Write a protein that binds this ligand. Sequence first.
Ligand SMILES: [Lu+3]
Length: 493
Amino acid sequence: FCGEPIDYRGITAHRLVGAEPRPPVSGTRYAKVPGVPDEYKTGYRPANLGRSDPDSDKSLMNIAVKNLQVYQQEPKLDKVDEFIERAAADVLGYLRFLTKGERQANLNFKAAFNTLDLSTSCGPFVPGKKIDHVKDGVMDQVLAKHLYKCWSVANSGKALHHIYACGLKDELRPLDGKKRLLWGCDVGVAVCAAAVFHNICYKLKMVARFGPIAVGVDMTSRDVDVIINNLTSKASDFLCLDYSKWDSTMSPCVVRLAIDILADCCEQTELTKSVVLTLKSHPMTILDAMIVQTKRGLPSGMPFTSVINSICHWLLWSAAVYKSCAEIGLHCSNLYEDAPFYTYGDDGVYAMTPMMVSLLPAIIENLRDYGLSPTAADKTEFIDVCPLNKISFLKRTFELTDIGWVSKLDKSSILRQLEWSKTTSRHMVIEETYDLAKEERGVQLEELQVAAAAHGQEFFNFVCRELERQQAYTQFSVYSYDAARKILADRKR
Ligand SMILES: [Lu+3]
């Protein structure tokens, strides 16, 4: 469905043909809670500032276009090397051992569709959400027709169309022009992928606290204790990194390899073959009346992105270390066992052997040569190893307590929930909202207390002072400090 080539600002796109256009949703759901004292403000701004951004050109179509160009750049790697190949053998061994050498069964249709949560857009070819098409217990005609075709094609072993609906991720961002894009997955690709991958990922989520793939981990439970015990079992030095533009730069050869590894322990049916073929192909995306191609990156809306991205990370981190050892004449192996690490998409925390610590600059450089842009986890310093009492993972830092280890969401993230509120209406600028008497706002603000309590009584009180004022706007309870601290306590154990 690509007609005539559009030529706008250097993007490879075409006029949408054979499909109805999918105009992206303008504005932001975030609106400012009125009367919030300045001491609780933190800086963040919605990604789509809208007419709050003085640049008149900073329109949604132009912003999406600029961000899509990144995926149209050549990948840093055209093919994988020996060190990545050595890492693949590690993951394969991990999966084969986990699955006891057994392939995981495909799901049949009903099971696969049931995995899809009610609140998901249906992608570029069917409007609205799943919930808008499975109302009175049964699927409407449009969804079923679309799903019947996809399921049929996929079961014949033929690749589906790897196409998404484009948009701007409506999120709060530091006041700094990279913005994440939305990749609304086709509901047909999503169901077939669910059928092929759900069982293996289920098995993976069950065992997430041991890692390396952290997808499924409960940062509120004893998972945290095993993650930390696992990290300190083999080392006393650690590396916490974040990566800039990870999704948008990822090399296809790595993504394809990750998918092949995840699929190797799945049932060998045509549906599997169809899914593997679909997801390995260059994703396309429909902005409005334009269809845009890509040459690199991993859509954040790709079914099972987290697991596959986590495998990519496992591969590149391990390879980076392997390559660095080889350059100093050392053959290194079984990294995930010698130096446990955890991965969750672009988020990683790794144990550091004394040899690894010494190889840090070369490891960082080899990560760069794989196309990655690592940045210190502690968003302020240069990259370096840190002691246990200093590690960072999944926007959390940790503290040894009498109730085991306890994870603390960075205070800024706590505070921003006081300043902003995800409203149910779109806003075209940064503005205040009064539509706050919402059930959701209520549970959010109660949960905020439990998160605040992890930081201590003083911080808790600070937050609770403002929450007490926000009680005029939202029906919700403000617990005592002990009460919230009992909730943390109960969540573990
Ligand atoms: Lu991050």
